[PDB]
DNA sequence: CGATCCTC
RNA sequence: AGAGG
């Protein structure tokens, strides 16, 4: 279930609960049409690519697929009323906050992602300790891990030291 | 000074490790860290 | 307290470092590689004192 | 450093009054952090101190020889005889307040070494100076008023950040920026510079 | 490689680094002499005219002063030598190479520069004494420690150059890092250890100390909080006064194990507004954790507010600890009399398990397990019994450690130490290995000449029965020395190899960047990715969250 | 092996399953053997995956491999980083290594390639073919003392 | 008498053990601090070396010359050279000491604290005389001389406090203990089995009643009744270390009070 | 206003779970056959043992900065020995007609079960707990 | 008299050594829990005996107190640092005209010493001072 | 080399005033006094006595950096009581206590023989 | 190298106790610990000052000039 | 030729951090060079602090040229670019 | 045909 | 060449 994704919906909801002084004792001014169509409309405005054509519109659709899976599950009609107990004013604010934070979460062009990726891999590699294997306690767990493995990978080694085939 | 006068150098099958046979002959501790570790020994 | 064991060359004190070498006239056997046509080698590093 | 692989530079210097004190008025000459102990597993450091404390009190040379029968218990038994708590702990009072510290401190003598290479022997700074002949770039070493190397590894972090202009500044204005004349035909440094 | 990709530069300074609990996260302690060497070319405008002319008359030897003066037609006036150094009446458009002063952007570096976080922009703070001073929470991204390390400082010379440092490279900006989509900074050492201690249910403070702690927070509202206790004494809890450091609108929830919204063990976490409801504040909250207090504060309140938080927590915690105190003696490695009896008999029964397997093997009754040698089976079992022994004995010791045990206290906080450390120092060091297996027969059929030929007993093959507290026997010592050496060679080997790998990684990826069409492309304009990381999102603005539709029973999904 | 599988009541459960670990690789032949799950068969030899199952499968195995080195240590690096490295080795059609005869042999800038390894000869064969350097690479602008199209330089500023 | 009370248990030429009752912990500490740091004294703060053919370096000798205890009884009737209107020093702000030693004997010749001799006009002030505590009739051993060896130098003794340099301290360790029975629960004793058995009981435990086992904790209780022992170097007498200690603290509190009037 | 809850409880269990000054009190009211109580008490100032009759009250008044207790002519709403200030954090309903309220007195937790609570305890950073005898 | 003998690593192969004289060869037939656990005899056909096990160490490591209570690389680290430490390198220092000289003003002999030190002349030309140290969290500096 | 002169601990510099009374912007009837070339000897002593006065609402001090001999003292008093008056009363009370102690020691000292 | 004046830790004048310390061991035949106590060096900081001092000066005085 | 039409612009309407930093830098450079200020300075003396207020009040006369990989480019004025950040 | 960073 | 992180 737990996957790194943009926008912390939990934090937005709890921020609304405090900001709008929500009481779990008063009935909500929300309607089913407000929640169902509200979350539906929010999904339309979560932008990554702003191309006016079929290819880029489907690319944009694909990019937001997972975050919308999260958005739907978190902002379901039952949950909004039963769990969260949000009002129309509070629910509307939650919707505006998600959209704003999502566009804020998008990568900026010019970002040298190449160097970023290389360093992000390179640094933890220097910090590695038991380069042989931590699975040395058992005689049937003999696989070249750590630094020598990373070396085999990166160089595209024609012959590995521990070539294995896991069969299901 | 005493330590320098009692130093050993091994140029260049694993020679960096403290081999069993070094007992009583070469110091188990005294060796430089990094670069030439276990190649520079002390009696 | 000076222990000696060094030389005075052009004023500078010089300590001669013990050089570790493999002993001569020693007969050592080795298993050789995986593709190699030859499987085992007997070697002698002959030398005169 | 202690005789136990415990490297450490000075953080601050405190005069006697700001320092914490024992009920006897004994103040430490040095203060080390308890954090530089568990991972390091330098148990001997603590034992040396326990022994050295009993040794200073009894007026004897402490035997710290390796393969012996000297035990932490035996040393502790001797220190308690000297009227101190067996494990080197001592009630200490705060220098600023005078109030007892809630915690008791491991206090005692420990042989420390004054190592070479001190701050002042290293403190270097350059904001323009002598240039190497061949490359027209800053020289090497402090004892020459040299420039610090902004290596390729450093260059990479600037690219990561996307600081294009600073990366250019370091590579030109801070080092070897130069004006050459080129022709629009051969495109080589052939052009004879005849200014004024 | 040495003159084009990298080179030696002007406006650079290097010095030994030292910790400062009174410096701000983004600040750097620059020694007076260094500040008096490095300059910034500042053009004379009516905004700075008076300040520049004062610094111009302050000279190159008095700190808030200047070195050279650049005139129209470009010619430097050396203020250390000029006969007109006293005179010099400034003009607009002229440049004044003024000394480096407070709150100037400067690039701070610690080599090897394996990160973007290895090079960060810091605000200047000119101080006495020869060391470069930094905040302990900025220790981790640089991977520094104050045991003799040195750091470089680079000075921007252009207005746009300093803007690149302040708006892109600044320390608060780098807090939440895209490498692991979590913060790359957190509360360490004294501050980590001390926070756990202060934050306990048992911890209560008197009015006299409360006011002092409240004042230490620079941001403080001036409103004295109502004490948790107003009975035969007005008493404040540690949790209350630390909540003063936490800003309003910060909501954090955790749940560890025994956590029940009624936290009997005082575990997990619950923070509602600028007040902590329950749970002890340790590494999981205040460290550089994923769902931690820092990731929350940076994302909610901002980078500048979060950087301020490091200072606030540090100023309070260190003060309380300064007056509470914290030590560690030889007494903390000492385990109970009956505990040692248990430990010694634990290793004794392990030695018996080994003897019996040995006896079984020697009788040819040891069964042939598929995929491995009859002897490979033996060694596998022996090593297992010996590792099980060390762990059982270690647990026996660590269980006996009281909550007042300074070593136990440090592990509990997450400042320093781990189980393995307690186990080796108090109970049993354990088995030693070289090339993955236990101590080999270097001599003919023996490890040492003190043993007999063909001896496979734990003691003869590197098993250290004794703890560091007890002391290692000569054989045990030499064996631990053998295993130790391997660790040092593996260190020496790694640093050089891992460094080359990183260089190759950087070189192969250099030119890959996100273009204006949200596509990842190289120097040839070739498409690597159609959307960065398959979504076109920046890694720093991402965090782990449960997709609620995937889990649970069908009945629970319906409900 | 431990396996997380959905129970008929909906919730995920632990279902232990028999798995075979092999000291050797011949994917081509082993997957054709009966009684196995050919959809699930795996090997650490990403070359063998690429040769038998294609480049896209090779990319999956390549990441799986890079990820495993990082994970084993305890460390965590964001997906996109390894994804980029993995895609870079993959995009050339096959498996382009991170060696001098891997990425450095590629059709990039003559100056940007001589910055890594084989410096002089890289320039020599560039002088023989008479290469035209784009000067769009980071390394060229670094060498030429110009503001590169990196972050700040990725756009021009007009009045 | 009135407010804070003193009860001297032990008194001698070198030490003063007393009970400081009816005081605040803040005052007990401020007095302890000021005794170590802010009471002024006379010490060598300039060494002009004429000849030095000894085995030791000039600054090594100079450093230990500053460490030599000198009479500071009448230190208040001597100025800090910084306030003095002279050029460098005079007889109102300094004491000039002369030291001349030669290896006259074949046997090693020792240089003692007694060998320093006042040149300056003392103007009838018990000041400058090197403090001689040693029974044998000589002070601090400064240097050792062989035969050909010679040492000739002039010393300027100036007024100052420990905050500037530790040599200006009438110092020596000050013993300080309050509440020996841990009734105030000011500390939490580390233990293995029994805190009572593992921790040794104080000398001050006789002077205070022990807590009555199953008695409720005294929350309201505050720190009063302090057990102190002030040791003197010899520069200034014991009583004066404490009196001038009270006096220095008194003066600097009054200093602030006066600054509020200038405002 | 005034009070919001008042009852006399009887101590069943007293647990000092690794704390030297704090104890977790398990109490049930002598009058109400459904009323429960779970609370962290500082035994160092006010000790509580097995089978004690405690008068527990939740007030709301006797915003702003705390002034030292200068009881010259001051009057706080107490003829009580133990006084605490806290925050309401969870109003979790247990069953059909059984509500539970959670209060944290600067980390010292409190849980009260029953149903007579009603529209009185309603979520507030304001909460005074008073105990006598 | 042949009471003692010279043995190299090749001849070491043919011999059986005892670590302690008494503890390694007396007889058989209660124990201090503080003392470390030692094997027993088991080996019986002893041809030689170790003069002292502490002799396996060399010059720098012979300065370390209780190395038998330390982690193996910490002993390695100190062996390099002892060579960095200041002290009186020689008595004739002021008579020699050498590049770089560092002499401790008041060097002190260590309170806790090894038996090896006597031959290493450590207490005669010391490299440090017996500082009253407190292991404590003070100002956090 | 970068080490500051020791007189800078107890001696005021050019333009350096002993006290600097600054009104607090966060609280009513509150002031922040900056004591120059002073430490814990005077800080903790004044703060503890200022606290003894039942007309004072707040009293706290801090030495923001050990390198410098400054200290900040924050005072908040009841309406109709100036913080400068509260500080003046504390100072006098301290001197009064010290005066008593001085003669008290002197009296008991003149009872001893050694 | 010559007995230090005053104890680094506390400042108790130790520079006048050495000649007397040496006499207590050589002539009086006392043990170091009991000899230290007789000179009034009660605290362990003062004790290490003398008991730990190496008087190198005597060796330096053996060189002629 | 080459350019892009005013209508239908795919590039992000929001200003990038790099765009912001360069704009802020370039404007601070001209302020330090005695160029006119387009906002009422309220005790502001630092060229970067002034430029920040000019971007806050949207009184900067600069255009960003967003170069697309195909050689083409998009022209965006600081006045139109959204400064969320 | 390569093998972390930095000063003497 | 030797060392420091
Ligand atoms: Mg380090
Ligand atoms: Zn041409
Ligand atoms: Zn004068
Ligand atoms: Zn002393």
From Swiss-Prot, chain A:
It is found in: Nucleus. The tandem 7 residues repeats in the C-terminal domain (CTD) can be highly phosphorylated. The phosphorylation activates Pol II. Phosphorylation occurs mainly at residues 'Ser-2' and 'Ser-5' of the heptapeptide repeat. The phosphorylated form of Pol II appears to carry, on average, one phosphate per repeat. The phosphorylation state is believed to result from the balanced action of site-specific CTD kinases and phosphatases, and a 'CTD code' that specifies the position of Pol II within the transcription cycle has been proposed. Signal peptide: none annotated. It comes from the Eukaryota. Mutagenesis experiments demonstrate that the minimum viable CTD contains eight consensus Y-S-P-T-S-P-[A-S-N-G] heptapeptide repeats. Identical and simultaneous substitutions in a number of consecutive repeats are lethal: 'Ser-2' -> 'Ala-2' (14 repeats), 'Ser-5' -> 'Ala-5' (15 repeats), '2-Ser-Pro-Thr-Ser-5'-> '2-Ala-Pro-Thr-Ala-5' (10 repeats), 'Ser-2'-> 'Glu-2' (15 repeats), 'Ser-5' -> 'Glu-5' (12 repeats), '2-Ser-Pro-3' -> '2-Pro-Ser-3' (15 repeats) and 'Tyr-1' -> 'Phe-1' (12 repeats). The C-terminal domain (CTD) serves as a platform for assembly of factors that regulate transcription initiation, elongation, termination and mRNA processing. This is DNA-directed RNA polymerase II subunit RPB1. The gene is RPO21.
Swiss-Prot record, chain D:
It is found in: Nucleus. Zn(2+) binds at residues 183, 186. A zinc finger (C4-type) spans 183-196. DNA-dependent RNA polymerase catalyzes the transcription of DNA into RNA using the four ribonucleoside triphosphates as substrates. Second largest component of RNA polymerases II which synthesizes mRNA precursors and many functional non-coding RNAs. Proposed to contribute to the polymerase catalytic activity and forms the polymerase active center together with the largest subunit. Pol II is the central component of the basal RNA polymerase II transcription machinery. The binding of ribonucleoside triphosphate to the RNA polymerase II transcribing complex probably involves a two-step mechanism. The initial binding seems to occur at the entry (E) site and involves a magnesium ion coordinated by three conserved aspartate residues of the two largest RNA Pol II subunits. Belongs to the RNA polymerase beta chain family. Component of the RNA polymerase II (Pol II) complex consisting of 12 subunits. This is DNA-directed RNA polymerase II subunit RPB2. It comes from Saccharomyces cerevisiae (strain ATCC 204508 / S288c). The lineage of its organism: Eukaryota, Fungi, Dikarya, Ascomycota, Saccharomycotina. The gene is RPB2. The chain holds residues 981 to 1176 of 1224 of the full protein.
Swiss-Prot record, chain H:
The modification N-acetylserine is found at residue 1. Pfam families: RNA_pol_Rpb8. GO terms for biological process: nucleolar large rRNA transcription by RNA polymerase I; ribosome biogenesis; RNA-templated transcription; termination of RNA polymerase I transcription; termination of RNA polymerase III transcription; transcription by RNA polymerase I; transcription by RNA polymerase II; transcription by RNA polymerase III. It comes from the Eukaryota. One of its GO terms (molecular function) is DNA binding. It is found in: Nucleus. Coiled coil: none annotated. Belongs to the eukaryotic RPB8 RNA polymerase subunit family. Component of the RNA polymerase I (Pol I), RNA polymerase II (Pol II) and RNA polymerase III (Pol III) complexes. Component of the RNA polymerase I (Pol I) complex consisting of 14 subunits: RPA135, RPA190, RPC40, RPA14, RPB5, RPO26, RPA43, RPB8, RPA12, RPB10, RPC19, RPC10, RPA49 and RPA34. The complex is composed of a horseshoe-shaped core containing ten subunits (RPA135, RPA190, RPB5, RPO26, RPB8, RPB10, RPC10, RPA12, RPC19 and RPC40) where RPA135 and RPA190 form the DNA-binding cleft. This is DNA-directed RNA polymerases I, II, and III subunit RPABC3. The gene is RPB8.
Swiss-Prot record, chain J:
Changing residue 114 to P: Transcript termination readthrough. It is found in: Nucleus. GO terms for molecular function: DNA binding; DNA-directed RNA polymerase activity; protein dimerization activity. Gene3D superfamilies: RNA polymerase, RBP11-like subunit (3.30.1360.10). Signal peptide: none annotated. SUPFAM superfamilies: RBP11-like subunits of RNA polymerase. Pfam families: RNA_pol_L_2 (PF13656). InterPro entries: RBP11, RBP11-like, RBP11-like_dimer, RNA_pol_Rpb11_13-16kDa_CS, Rpo11-like. One of its GO terms (biological process) is transcription elongation by RNA polymerase II. It comes from the Eukaryota. Keywords: DNA-directed RNA polymerase, Nucleus, Transcription. DNA-dependent RNA polymerase catalyzes the transcription of DNA into RNA using the four ribonucleoside triphosphates as substrates. Component of RNA polymerase II which synthesizes mRNA precursors and many functional non-coding RNAs. Pol II is the central component of the basal RNA polymerase II transcription machinery. It is composed of mobile elements that move relative to each other. RPB11 is part of the core element with the central large cleft. Seems to be involved transcript termination. This is DNA-directed RNA polymerase II subunit RPB11. It comes from Saccharomyces cerevisiae (strain ATCC 204508 / S288c).
């Amino acid at each position: 279930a737990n996957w790194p994704l943009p926008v912390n919906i939990r934090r937005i909801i709890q921020n609304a609960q405090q900001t709008f002084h929500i009481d779990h004792t008063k009935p909500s001014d929300l309607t089913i049409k407000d929640i169902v169509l509200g979350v539906k409309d929010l999904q339309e405005n979560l932008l990554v690519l702003r191309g006016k054509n079929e290819i880029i519109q489907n690319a944009q659709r694909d990019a937001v697929t997972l975050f919308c899976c999260l958005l739907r599950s978190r902002l379901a009609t039952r949950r909004v009323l039963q769990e969260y107990r949000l009002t129309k004013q509070a629910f509307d604010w939650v919707l505006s906050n998600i959209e704003a934070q999502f566009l804020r979460s998008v990568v900026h062009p010019g970002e040298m992602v190449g160097v970023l990726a290389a360093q992000s891999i390179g640094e933890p590699a220097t910090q590695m300790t038991l380069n042989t294997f931590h699975f040395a306690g058992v005689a049937s767990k003999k696989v070249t891990s750590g630094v020598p493995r990373l070396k085999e990978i990166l160089n595209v080694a024609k012959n590995m030291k521990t070539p294995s085939l896991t069969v299901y | 000074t005493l330590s320098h006068l009692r130093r050993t150098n091994t140029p260049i099958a694993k020679p960096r490790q403290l081999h069993n046979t070094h007992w009583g002959l070469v110091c188990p501790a005294e060796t430089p860290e990094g670069q030439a570790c276990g190649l520079v020994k002390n009696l | 307290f000076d222990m000696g064991g060094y030389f005075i060359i052009n004023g500078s004190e010089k300590v001669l470092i013990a050089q570790e070498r493999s002993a001569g006239n020693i007969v050592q056997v080795f298993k050789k590689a995986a593709p190699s046509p030859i499987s085992h080698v007997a070697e002698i590093r002959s030398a005169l004192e | 450093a202690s005789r136990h692989g415990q490297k450490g530079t000075i953080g601050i210097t405190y005069r006697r009054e700001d320092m914490p004190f024992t009920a006897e008025g004994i103040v430490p000459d040095l203060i080390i952090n308890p954090h530089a102990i568990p991972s390091r597993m330098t148990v001997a450091h603590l034992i040396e101190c326990l022994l050295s404390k009993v040794a200073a009190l009894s007026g004897n040379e402490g035997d710290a020889s390796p393969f012996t029968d000297i035990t932490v218990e035996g040393i502790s038994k001797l220190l308690r005889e000297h009227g101190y708590q067996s494990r080197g702990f001592e009630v200490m009072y705060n220098g600023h307040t005078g109030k007892k510290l809630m915690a008791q401190i491991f206090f005692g003598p420990t042989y420390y070494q004054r190592l070479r290479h001190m701050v002042d022997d290293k403190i270097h700074a350059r904001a323009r100076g002598p240039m190497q002949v061949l490359t027209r770039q800053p020289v090497e070493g402090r004892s020459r008023d040299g420039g610090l190397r902004f290596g390729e590894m450093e260059r990479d972090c600037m690219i990561a950040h996307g600081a294009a202009s600073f990366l250019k500044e370091r590579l030109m204005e801070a080092s070897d920026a130069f004006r050459v004349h080129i022709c629009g035909i051969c495109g080589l440094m052939t052009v004879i510079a005849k200014l004024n | 490689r040495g003159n084009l990709m990298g080179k030696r530069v002007d406006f650079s300074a290097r010095t030994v680094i030292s910790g400062d609990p009174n410096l701000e996260l983004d600040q750097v302690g620059v020694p007076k002499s260094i500040a008096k060497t490095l300059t910034y070319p500042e053009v004379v405008t009516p905004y700075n005219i008076d300040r520049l002319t004062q610094l111009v008359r302050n000279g190159p030897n008095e700190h808030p002063g200047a070195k050279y003066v650049i005139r129209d037609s470009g010619d430097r006036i050396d203020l250390r030598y000029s006969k007109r150094a006293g005179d010099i009446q400034l003009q607009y458009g002229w440049k004044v190479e003024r000394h480096i002063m407070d709150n100037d952007p400067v690039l701070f570096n610690r080599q090897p520069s394996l990160h973007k976080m290895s090079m960060m922009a810091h605000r200047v703070k000119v101080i006495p004494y020869s060391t470069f001073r930094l905040n302990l929470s900025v220790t981790s991204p640089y991977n520094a420690d104050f045991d003799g390390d040195e750091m470089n400082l680079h000075v921007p010379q252009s207005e746009e150059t300093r803007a690149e440092l302040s708006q892109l490279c600044a320390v608060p900006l780098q807090i939440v890092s895209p490498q692991s989509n979590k913060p790359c900074m957190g509360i360490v050492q004294d501050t980590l250890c001390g926070i756990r201690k202060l934050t306990l249910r048992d911890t209560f403070i008197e009015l006299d100390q409360v006011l002092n702690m409240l004042y230490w927070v620079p941001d403080w509202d001036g409103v004295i909080p109502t004490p948790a206790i107003i009975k035969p004494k007005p008493l404040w809890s540690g949790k209350q006064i630390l909540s003063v450091a936490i800003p309003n609108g910060i909501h954090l929830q955790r749940f560890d194990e025994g956590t029940t919204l009624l936290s009997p063990k005082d575990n997990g976490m619950l923070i509602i507004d600028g007040q902590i409801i329950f749970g002890v504040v340790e590494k999981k909250t205040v460290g550089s954790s994923n769902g931690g207090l820092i990731h929350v504060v940076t994302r909610e309140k901002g980078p500048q507010v979060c950087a301020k938080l490091f200072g606030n927590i540090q100023k309070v915690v260190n003060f309380w600890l300064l007056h509470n105190g914290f030590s560690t003696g030889i007494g903390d490695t000492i385990a109970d009399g009956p505990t040692m009896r248990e430990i010694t008999e634990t290793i004794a029964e392990a030695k018996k398990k080994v003897l019996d397997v040995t006896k079984e093997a020697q009788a040819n009754l040891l069964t042939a397990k598929h995929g491995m040698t009859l002897r490979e089976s033996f060694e596998d079992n022996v090593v297992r019994f010996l590792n099980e022994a060390r762990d059982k004995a270690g647990r026996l010791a660590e269980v006996n450690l009281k909550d007042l045990n300074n070593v136990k206290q440090m592990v509990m906080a997450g400042s320093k130490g781990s189980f393995i450390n307690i186990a080796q120092m108090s109970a049993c060091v354990g088995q030693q290995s070289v090339e993955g297996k236990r101590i080999a027969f270097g001599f003919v059929d023996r490890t040492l000449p003190h043993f007999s030929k063909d001896d496979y007993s734990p003691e003869s093959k590197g098993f250290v029965e004794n703890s560091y507290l007890r002391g290692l026997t000569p054989q045990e010592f030499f064996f631990h020395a053998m295993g130790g050496r391997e660790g040092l060679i593996d260190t020496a080997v790694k640093t050089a190899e891992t460094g080359y790998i990183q260089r190759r990684l950087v070189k192969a990826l250099e030119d890959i960047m996100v273009h204006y069409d949200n596509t990842t492309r190289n120097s040839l304009g070739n498409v690597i990715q159609f959307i960065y990381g398959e979504d076109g999102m920046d890694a720093a603005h991402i965090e782990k969250q449960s997709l609620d539709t995937i889990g649970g029973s069908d009945a629970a999904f319906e409900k | 092996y431990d396996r997380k599988v959905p129970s008929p009541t909906g919730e995920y459960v632990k279902e232990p399953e028999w798995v075979l670990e092999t000291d050797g690789v011949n994917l081509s032949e082993v997957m054709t053997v009966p009684g196995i799950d050919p959809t699930r068969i795996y090997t650490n030899s990403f070359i063998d995956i690429m040769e038998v199952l294609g480049i896209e499968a090779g990319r999956a195995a390549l990441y799986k491999e890079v990820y495993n080195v990082i994970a084993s240590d305890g460390s965590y690096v964001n997906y996109r980083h390894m994804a980029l490295l993995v895609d870079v080795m993959t995009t050339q059609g096959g498996l382009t290594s991170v060696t001098r005869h891997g990425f450095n042999r590629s059709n990039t800038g003559a100056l940007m390639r001589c910055s890594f390894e084989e410096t002089v000869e890289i320039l020599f064969e560039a002088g023989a073919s008479a290469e035209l350097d784009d000067c769009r690479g980071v390394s060229e602008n670094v060498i030429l003392g110009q503001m590169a199209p990196i972050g700040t330089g990725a756009f021009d500023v007009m009045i | 008498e009135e407010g804070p009370q003193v009860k001297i248990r032990e008194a001698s030429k070198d030490n003063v053990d007393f009970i400081l009752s009816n005081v605040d912990l803040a005052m007990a500490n401020s007095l302890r601090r000021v005794m170590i740091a802010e009471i002024p004294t006379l010490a060598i703060d300039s060494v002009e070396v004429e000849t030095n053919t000894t085995v030791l370096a000039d600054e090594f000798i100079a450093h230990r010359l500053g460490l030599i205890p000198l009479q500071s009884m009448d230190i208040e009737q001597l100025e800090y050279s910084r306030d003095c209107f002279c050029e460098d020093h005079c007889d109102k702000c300094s004491v000039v000491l002369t030291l001349q030693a030669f290896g006259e004997s074949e046997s090693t010749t020792n240089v003692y604290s007694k060998d320093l001799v006042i040149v300056s006009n003392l103007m009838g002030r018990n000041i400058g005389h090197p403090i001689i505590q040693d029974k044998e009739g000589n002070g601090v051993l400064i240097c050792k001389l062989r035969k050909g060896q010679e040492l000739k130098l002039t010393c300027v003794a100036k007024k100052g406090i420990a905050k500037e340099h530790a040599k200006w301290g009438p110092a020596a360790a000050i013993e300080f203990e309050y509440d020996p029975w841990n009734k105030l629960k000011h500390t939490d004793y580390w233990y293995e089995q029994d805190s009572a058995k593992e921790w040794p009981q104080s000398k001050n435990c006789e002077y205070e009643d022990p807590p009555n086992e199953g008695d409720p904790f005294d929350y309201k209780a505050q720190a009063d009744t302090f057990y102190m022992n002030v040791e003197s170097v010899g520069s200034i007498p014991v009583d004066q270390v404490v009196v001038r200690g009270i006096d220095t603290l008194q003066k600097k509190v009054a200093s602030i009070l006066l600054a509020l009037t200038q405002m | 206003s005034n009070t919001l809850f008042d009852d006399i409880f009887q101590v069943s269990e007293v647990d000092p779970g690794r704390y030297n000054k704090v104890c977790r009190i398990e109490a049930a009211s002598t009058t109400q056959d459904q009323c429960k109580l779970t609370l962290d008490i500082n035994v160092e100032l006010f000790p509580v043992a097995a089978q004690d009759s405690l008068t527990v009250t939740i007030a709301s008044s006797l915003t702003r900065s705390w002034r030292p207790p200068q009881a010259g002519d001051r009057s706080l709403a107490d003829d009580y020995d133990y006084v605490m200030y806290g925050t309401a954090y969870k109003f979790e309903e247990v069953s059909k007609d059984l509500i539970a309220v959670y209060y944290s007195f600067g980390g010292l937790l409190m849980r009260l079960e029953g149903n007579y609570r009603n529209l009185n305890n309603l979520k507030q950073e304001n909460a005074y707990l008073l105990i006598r005898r | 008299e042949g009471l003692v003998e010279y043995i190299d690593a090749e001849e070491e192969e043919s011999i059986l050594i005892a670590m302690q004289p008494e503890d390694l060869e007396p007889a058989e037939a209660d124990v201090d829990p503080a003392k470390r656990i030692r094997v027993s005899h088991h080996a019986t056909t002893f041809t030689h005996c170790e003069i002292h096990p502490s002799m396996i160490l060399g010059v720098a490591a012979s300065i370390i107190p209780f190395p038998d209570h330390n982690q193996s690389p910490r002993n390695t680290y100190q062996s390099a640092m002892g060579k960095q430490a200041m002290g009186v390198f020689l008595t004739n220092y002021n008579v020699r005209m050498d590049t770089m000289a560092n002499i401790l003003y008041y060097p002190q002999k260590p309170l806790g010493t090894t038996r090896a030190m006597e031959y290493l002349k450590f207490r005669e030309l010391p490299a440090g001072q017996n500082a009253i140290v407190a292991i404590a969290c003070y100002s956090g500096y | 080399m970068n080490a500051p002169d020791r007189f800078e601990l107890f001696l005021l510099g050019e333009g350096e005033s002993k006290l600097k009374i600054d009104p607090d912007t966060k609280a009513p009837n509150a002031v922040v006094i900056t004591f120059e070339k002073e430490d814990h000897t005077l800080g903790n002593l004044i703060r503890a006595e200022l606290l003894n006065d039942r007309k004072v609402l707040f009293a706290a001090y801090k030495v923001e950096h050990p390198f410098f001999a400054r200290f900040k003292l924050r005072i908040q008093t009841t309406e109709g009581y100036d913080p400068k008056d509260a500080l003046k009363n504390a100072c006098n009370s301290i001197i009064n206590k010290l005066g008593a102690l001085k003669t008290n020691f002197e009296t008991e000292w003149n009872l001893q023989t050694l | 190298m010559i007995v230090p004046v005053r104890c680094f830790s506390c400042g108790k004048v130790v520079g006048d106790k050495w000649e007397s310390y040496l006499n207590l061991l050589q002539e009086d035949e006392l043990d170091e610990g009991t000899a230290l106590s007789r000179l009034g060096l009660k605290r362990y900081c003062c004790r290490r000052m003398i008991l730990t001092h190496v008087d190198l000066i005597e060796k330096f005085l053996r060189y002629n000039p | 030729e080459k350019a892009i039409p005013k209508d239908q612009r795919a590039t992000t309407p929001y200003m990038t951090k790099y765009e912001r930093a360069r704009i802020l830098g370039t404007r601070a450079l001209q302020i330090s060079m005695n160029a006119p200020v387009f906002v009422d300075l309220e005790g502001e003396t630092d060229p970067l602090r002034i430029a920040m207020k000019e971007l806050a009040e949207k009184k900067i006369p600069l255009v960003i040229r967003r170069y697309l990989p195909d050689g083409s480019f998009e022209d965006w004025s600081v006045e139109e670019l959204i400064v969320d950040l």
